[PDB]
Amino acid sequence: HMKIIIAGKNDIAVNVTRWLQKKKKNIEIYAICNANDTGIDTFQRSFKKYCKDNLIPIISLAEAYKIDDAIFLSLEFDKIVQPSKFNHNELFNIHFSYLPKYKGMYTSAWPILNGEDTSGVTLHKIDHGIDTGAIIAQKEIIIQPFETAKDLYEKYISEGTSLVIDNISTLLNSEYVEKEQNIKYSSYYSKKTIDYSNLELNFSKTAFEIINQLRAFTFREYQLPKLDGVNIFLGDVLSSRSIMKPGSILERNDKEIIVSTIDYDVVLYKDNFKEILEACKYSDSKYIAKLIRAKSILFEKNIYGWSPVIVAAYHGNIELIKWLVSKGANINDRNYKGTTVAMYFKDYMLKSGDYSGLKMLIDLGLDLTLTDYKDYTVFDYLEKSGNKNLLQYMMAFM
Amino acid sequence: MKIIIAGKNDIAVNVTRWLQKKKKNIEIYAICNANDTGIDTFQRSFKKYCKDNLIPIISLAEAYKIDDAIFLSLEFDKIVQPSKFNHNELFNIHFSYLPKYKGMYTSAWPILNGEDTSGVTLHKIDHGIDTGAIIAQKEIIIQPFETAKDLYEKYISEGTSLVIDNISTLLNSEYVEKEQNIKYSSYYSKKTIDYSNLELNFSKTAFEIINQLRAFTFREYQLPKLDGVNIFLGDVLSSRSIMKPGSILERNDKEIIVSTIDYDVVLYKDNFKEILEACKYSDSKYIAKLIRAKSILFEKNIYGWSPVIVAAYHGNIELIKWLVSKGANINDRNYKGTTVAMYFKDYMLKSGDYSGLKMLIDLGLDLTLTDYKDYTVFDYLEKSGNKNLLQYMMAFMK
Ligand SMILES: Cc1cn([C@H]2C[C@H](O)[C@@H](COP(=O)(O)OP(=O)(O)O[C@H]3O[C@H](C)[C@H](O)[C@H](N)[C@H]3O)O2)c(=O)[nH]c1=O
Ligand SMILES: Cc1cn([C@H]2C[C@H](O)[C@@H](COP(=O)(O)OP(=O)(O)O[C@H]3O[C@H](C)[C@H](O)[C@H](N)[C@H]3O)O2)c(=O)[nH]c1=O
Ligand SMILES: Cc1cn([C@H]2C[C@H](O)[C@@H](COP(=O)(O)OP(=O)(O)O[C@H]3O[C@H](C)[C@H](O)[C@H](N)[C@H]3O)O2)c(=O)[nH]c1=O
Ligand code: NA
Ligand code: NA
Ligand code: NA
Numbered sequence: 001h002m003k004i005i006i007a008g009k010n011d012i013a014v015n016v017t018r019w020l021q022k023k024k025k026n027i028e029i030y031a032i033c034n035a036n037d038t039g040i041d042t043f044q045r046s047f048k049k050y051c052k053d054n055l056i057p058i059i060s061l062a063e064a065y066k067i068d069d070a071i072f073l074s075l076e077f078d079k080i081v082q083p084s085k086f087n088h089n090e091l092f093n094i095h096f097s098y099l100p101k102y103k104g105m106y107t108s109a110w111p112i113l114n115g116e117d118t119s120g121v122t123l124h125k126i127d128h129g130i131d132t133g134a135i136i137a138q139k140e141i142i143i144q145p146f147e148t149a150k151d152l153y154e155k156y157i158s159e160g161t162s163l164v165i166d167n168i169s170t171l172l173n174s175e176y177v178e179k180e181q182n183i184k185y186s187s188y189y190s191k192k193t194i195d196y197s198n199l200e201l202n203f204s205k206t207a208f209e210i211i212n213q214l215r216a217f218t219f220r221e222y223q224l225p226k227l228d229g230v231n232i233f234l235g236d237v238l239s240s241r242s243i244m245k246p247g248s249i250l251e252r253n254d255k256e257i258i259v260s261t262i263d264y265d266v267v268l269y270k271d272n273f274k275e276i277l278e279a280c281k282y283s284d285s286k287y288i289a290k291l292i293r294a295k296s297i298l299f300e301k302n303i304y305g306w307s308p309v310i311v312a313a314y315h316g317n318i319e320l321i322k323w324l325v326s327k328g329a330n331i332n333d334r335n336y337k338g339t340t341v342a343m344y345f346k347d348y349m350l351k352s353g354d355y356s357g358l359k360m361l362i363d364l365g366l367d368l369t370l371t372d373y374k375d376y377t378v379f380d381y382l383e384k385s386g387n388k389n390l391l392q393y394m395m396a397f398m
Numbered sequence: 399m400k401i402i403i404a405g406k407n408d409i410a411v412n413v414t415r416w417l418q419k420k421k422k423n424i425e426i427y428a429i430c431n432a433n434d435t436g437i438d439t440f441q442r443s444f445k446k447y448c449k450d451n452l453i454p455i456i457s458l459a460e461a462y463k464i465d466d467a468i469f470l471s472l473e474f475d476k477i478v479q480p481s482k483f484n485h486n487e488l489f490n491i492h493f494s495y496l497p498k499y500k501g502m503y504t505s506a507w508p509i510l511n512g513e514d515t516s517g518v519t520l521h522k523i524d525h526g527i528d529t530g531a532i533i534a535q536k537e538i539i540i541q542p543f544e545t546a547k548d549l550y551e552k553y554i555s556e557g558t559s560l561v562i563d564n565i566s567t568l569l570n571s572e573y574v575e576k577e578q579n580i581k582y583s584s585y586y587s588k589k590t591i592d593y594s595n596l597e598l599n600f601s602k603t604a605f606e607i608i609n610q611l612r613a614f615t616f617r618e619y620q621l622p623k624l625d626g627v628n629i630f631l632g633d634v635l636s637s638r639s640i641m642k643p644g645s646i647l648e649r650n651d652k653e654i655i656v657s658t659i660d661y662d663v664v665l666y667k668d669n670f671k672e673i674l675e676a677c678k679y680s681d682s683k684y685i686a687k688l689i690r691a692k693s694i695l696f697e698k699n700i701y702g703w704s705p706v707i708v709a710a711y712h713g714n715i716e717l718i719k720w721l722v723s724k725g726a727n728i729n730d731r732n733y734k735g736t737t738v739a740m741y742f743k744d745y746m747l748k749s750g751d752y753s754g755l756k757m758l759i760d761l762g763l764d765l766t767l768t769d770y771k772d773y774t775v776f777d778y779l780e781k782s783g784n785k786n787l788l789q790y791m792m793a794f795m796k
Contacts, residue, residue, distance in 0.1 A: 103603065103659065115582060128640045132660050181660065183634050185512060186603035188659045206500065206583035237580050243525045262500065262585045263529050263578065 002172055005064050007032035008075030010044040012094065015161045016075060017050065020168070027172075031056045032064060034078040041336050041373070043221045043301065044157075071171050073164070074126060081126050091126035091133075092171055094164055096156040098138055099124060100186035103131040108149040108156065110189050112216040115208065118142055119152065121160045123167055125178055130188070134178035137167050146296060148218035148234075201225060203247035207237040207264040214268070220300060224271055227257055231271035234294035238265040255293060269293035273300050280311040285323040298327055305335025314344040318357045322364065331365045338372030346378050346390070355393055362397060399569055402461050404429035405472030407441035409491065409554045413472060413561050414447065424569070427464065428455050431475040438733055438770070440618050440698070441554075468568055471523060472557070478523050488523035488530075489568055491561060493553040495519060495535055497583040500528035505550040507586050508540065509613040512605065515539055516549065518557040520564055522575060527585070531575035534564050543693060545615035545631070598622055600644035604634040604661040611665070617697060621668055624654055630668035631691035637662045652690065666690035670697050677705045678712040682720035695724055702732030711741040715754040719761065728762045735770035739763050743775050743791065752790055759794050 004027055006017055013031075020029060031051040039048040051058050064072065065085040074081060074093040083091055096107045098120025111119045119141045125133030139159050143152055170176040201213055214235050217225045224231040228249075242250055242260035250265060251258040257268045276291055276298075288308075292298065301307050309329045312320045321341075325331050334340050341361070349355055358366075371377050382391040401424055403414055410428075417424060434445040448455050458476050461469065468487035471478065480488055493504040495517025508516045516538045522530030536559075538552050567573040598610055611632050614622040621628040639647055639657035647662065648655040654665045673688050673695075685705075689695065698704045706726040709717045722728050731737050742763075746752050755763075768774050779788040 100603070100660070115584070127638075129638060130659055132638060183603075183605055183661055186605040186660055187512065188601070188603050188606065190601050192601075204585070204587050206497070206580075206585050208580055208583040209585065241524070241526055241529060262527055263497070263583055264580055 002027045003030070003067065003070035004028075004172065005030045005032065005059075005067065005070050005072045006075065007061070007064070007072065007077040007079075007081075009034040009037050009047045009078070010076055010157060012157045012160050012164075013047040013075045014045040014050045016073075016164050016168075017047075017054075017056065019161075019165055021054065024172075029056050030064065030067065030070070031058050032061055032077065033058060034076070036078070042303075043305070043336060045373075072126070073171070075160070075164070083127055089125075090171070090174065092136075093124055093126050093131075093133065094160045095122050095124065095131050096153075096160060097131075098122065098140060099131060099135060100181040100183075103186065103188040104193075105189050105191050106194050107189075108153040108219070109194060109216040112143065112149055112152065112212055113209075115212055116143060117145075119156075121156055121163050123163055124181075132181065134180045136170075136176050136178050137163060139163055146215075146234075146294075148215050148296070150219040150221075151296075153219065196222070199223060199225070201227065203259060203261055205246075205262055207261045207266045210259075210261055210266050211235055211237060220273075221303075225268075227259075227268055230257070232257075232268045233271040233273065233297055233300075235266055235268040238267060240265045273297060274302075277302065277306065277308065277311055280308045280317065280320060281315045282317060284319055288320065288323070295327065298324060298329055301335075305337070305339070307333050309333045309341055310335060310344050313341045313361075314348060316348045316352060316354070316357070318360055321361065325364050331361065332367050332370060334372075338374070340367075340370050340372065340378070342366055342368055342370065342378050343372070343381065346381065349390060350387060355390070358394070358397070368394060368397060399424045400427070400464065400467035401425070401569070402427045402429065402456075402464065402467050402469045403444075403472060404458070404461070404469065404474040404476070404478075406431040406434050406444050406475075407473055407554060409557050409561075410444040410472045411442045411447045412558050413470070413565075414444075414451075414453070416562055417565075418451070421569075426453050427461065427467070428453050429458060429461060429474065429476070430455055431473070433475075439700075440702070440733060442733075442770070469523070470561070470565075470568070472561070480523060480525060486522075487568070487571070489533070490521055490523050490528075490530070491557040492519050492521065492528050493550075493557065494528075495537060496521060496528060496532060497578040497581075500583070500585040502586050502588050503591050505546040505553060505616070506591060506613045509544075509546060509549065509609055512609055513540060516553075518553055518560050520560050521578075529578065531577045533567075533573050533575060534560060536560055543612075543631075543691075545612050545693070547616040547618070548693075550616070593619065596620065596622060598624065600656055600658055602643075602659055604658045604663045607656075607658055607663050608632055608634060617670075624656075624665060627654075628668040629654075629665045630670065630694050630697075632663055632665040635662040635664060664690075668694075670694055671699075674699060674703065674705060674708055677708040677714065677717060679714065681716055685717065685720070692724060695721060695726055698732075702734070702736075704730050706730050707732060707738055707741055710738045711745055713742070713745040713749055713751060713754060715757055718758065722761050728758065729764045729767060731767075731769075735768070737764070737767045737769065737775070739765050739767065739775050740769065740778065743779070743787065746791075747784065747787060752787075755791060755794050759796060765791060765795050 006013055006029060020027060033048040037046055037048040039046050041049060061079055068087050072091045083089060099122040102110055121139050122135055123137045124135045127133040141155050141159055199217060214225050214232060224233060241263060242265050244260040246261050248260040249257060250260060255270055259266050272291060279288055298308050309321055309324050310333055332340055368378055403410055417426060428448045430445045434443055436443050436445045438446060462482040465484050471490045496519040499507060517535055519535040520533045524530035536556055538556055540549055596614055600607060611622055638661050641657040643658050645657045646654060647657060652667060656663050676685060695705050706718060706721045707730055729737055765775055776788060
């Protein structure tokens with residue numbers, strides 16, 4: 001007979017809540033949404049939409065203060081919570097850093113900017129201050145030297161979810177231990193510290209710092225870094241050192257811009273993502289591999305959620321998908337409605353007549369049991385459509 | 399052999415002294431910095447040293463035309479162009495552990511960033527800023543309480559020994575170069591801190607604020623100010639005010655308590671002038687009440703008078719025992735190299751009270767030390783004709 005208030009947004013609020021509904025069947029859940037939650041799924045799920053679709057009441061923070069015998073759990077929530085205004089003190093938060101480092105804002109960029117190898121997530125209490133409350137549990141996170149602010153954000157979402165999950169019984173049962181945050185090594189960045197409205201690359205810096213500025217600001221659904229009009233998608237460092245003033249453009253071609261820094265010259269790769277996506281329809285390994293500078297651009301997505309594997313799978317392109325997957329791409333990658341590669345390869349199989357591919361993708365680890373966000377498998381869509389031919393063929397693989 | 403020393407302060411002077419002693423036959427040419435006044439201050443004037451010792455002072459343009467010489471820059475202020483020499487025996491001491499902290503304000507930035515360590519590096523002068531290949535380096539530990547001035551002093555001392563330990567290899571071409579790493583390379587230009595408009599930022603953690611204080615505590619240039627009131631360090635409390643960061647919570651004659659992003663901070667108002675005045679005659683009990691930050695006891699006025707020196711000159715033995723216990727140097731010098739023993743002897747001379755000498759001798763007072771004129775205390779006594787004092791001091795000398 002418990003109550004929990006979940007205040008926040010995105011896949012973390014969604015996936016924690018999914019877990020609570022399945023695992024704590026009889027808990028009453030109340031939700032608070034963030035101001036900019038459009039109730040529509042984008043590269044993150046809408047928490048508002050999830051709650052509507054799954055009969056979770058949506059309340060105000062004002063209304064939530066007046067609840068008794070409820071845990072409060074903030075998951076990338078956007079409004080200051082004032083502990084005094086509840087009748088208890090069971091107020092909790094996931095913050096996307098290894099506290100007490102990187103309190104405050106832009107924790108997907110700042111660590112990268114500062115040349116960190118690691119970050120973390122932290123479960124702690126909400127007290128009056130900004131990420132000041134006592135720590136309950138933490139998990140260290142490795143940042144690979146190629147990963148972007150988006151890859152890091154995605155690790156935070158994943159690990160933050162898991163961490164809430166490994167501790168939520170102890171929050172609900174008051175069975176948890178806390179410890180006050182240390183003084184030493186504490187750091188905080190306000191909203192002022194980056195003006196995302198007015199981004200500017202600083203070339204009076206080292207190659208390392210410049211590469212890290214690129215990584216820090218590479219989060220496509222918001223922005224890419226820009227050099228004199230042109231969008232950039234990562235870069236590299238050369239062994240040469242230009243005598244030219246830092247910022248000086250040494251070379252330009254259609255794929256890359258080379259620039260002088262405080263030490264080593266840096267190559268900045270022009271963003272060719274749309275172009276790589278058009279090509280993924282029918283071109284082959286050779287041609288695509290010739291288009292690619294930063295390997296990770298194969299895992300990027302447009303506003304619909306379409307990655308290269310997805311567009312390829314939708315157009316038949318079997319030899320590409322094999323190579324994409326050898327490059328580390330996900331054979332069961334999904335768009336922003338939960339739609340899987342398998343489901344894309346369906347529309348082709350249907351429109352072509354050629355089912356000789358399907359076993360190829362199965363060897364590669366394709367999974368037919370997967371459902372989208374309306375709980376529908378590929379088998380459900382085929383049944384619905386009347387394509388018992390295609391249906392029965394596919395059922396053979398089970 | 400021949401050598402060109404280009405730079406300023408005790409590092410230039412003391413490297414040069416070592417060469418005059420231990421490499422008699424090398425010819426030495428000197429380049430001075432543009433703000434070397436010729437008058438010794440908290441750092442010696444290299445200019446003065448050179449004029450006093452008949453070392454010729456030349457320009458960088460003249461330096462380029464000297465073959466048969468290696469070039470060694472020591473906190474030098476002018477851009478060196480390697481293509482204008484007819485050789486490549488060009489070396490620098492930079493005050494950081496490269497490839498980190500290239501560029502400016504190296505006694506400030508590492509402290510600002512919460513570093514536990516820094517270093518000094520010996521490397522080649524290349525076309526860029528602090529970019530040339532490394533020859534040798536040494537780690538420096540930054541103690542938690544040390545200020546920017548303390549770290550500068552460590553840089554000067556350690557930079558000096560790094561040169562001394564390597565200079566034969568430089569002169570003999572037995573040294574080994576290795577190009578700087580890309581990874582972890584950092585750089586701070588002159589625009590990163592504006593010493594004309596220093597403001598403390600209280601939208602930061604208590605750690606970050608104490609480190610702001612440390613970083614800006616370099617008395618010869620400035621102290622940090624809160625409301626035009628000079629501050630000499632501070633401490634963190636265990637309370638955390640709800641008030642907005644920067645809200646002053648408590649004032650008194652001695653300190654100012656402020657809200658930060660996490661824990662409250664005490665800023666100590668600077669009272670060094672008052673402390674130095676009181677050391678003439680007051681006892682340890684009175685000075686103890688006056689002290690907040692213990693390191694204020696090692697500070698100096700424009701003459702180079704520290705507490706221990708003022709106490710010596712007034713025969714304040716009881717206070718000297720305490721200061722030493724506190725960490726003060728028993729052989730502390732003013733900016734003319736005049737030692738505590740030289741000041742004590744003036745007190746013994748005027749007063750006729752000699753009893754205190756043994757105590758100071760037992761605390762490690764060193765009577766062999768020379769000032770920047772190569773005079774010992776005994777040379778002063780022989781010149782004044784004071785034999786009885788000479789003999790007495792000599793009798794207690796260990
Ligand atoms: C606003 C913005 C964000 N980003 C990136 C960097 C951020 O780490 C990431 C997420 O942005 P965000 O607006 O969610 O804000 P963050 O600063 O990441 O998180 C703060 O704001 C949240 C609502 C939470 O209260 C969180 N506890 C706060 O630390 O998106 C951009 O690349 N461009 C942008 O223009
Ligand atoms: C990948 C891809 C998709 N499309 C199409 C297919 C869709 O009708 C439309 C929007 O795609 P979407 O990712 O929003 O797909 P969804 O609406 O998520 O999934 C539907 O379309 C799939 C192909 C299956 O039919 C599935 N069972 C449907 O529920 O654009 C292209 O035109 N070019 C493409 O390269
Ligand atoms: C100028 C200035 C310096 N300082 C401190 C911080 C500095 O690290 C330290 C020394 O000052 P400085 O003018 O020598 O400048 P730094 O920036 O330390 O050294 C640079 O300039 C030198 C001439 C050398 O070329 C060196 N390689 C450079 O990095 O004193 C202040 O506290 N207030 C000040 O206004
Ligand atoms: Na360059
Ligand atoms: Na400046
Ligand atoms: Na506060």
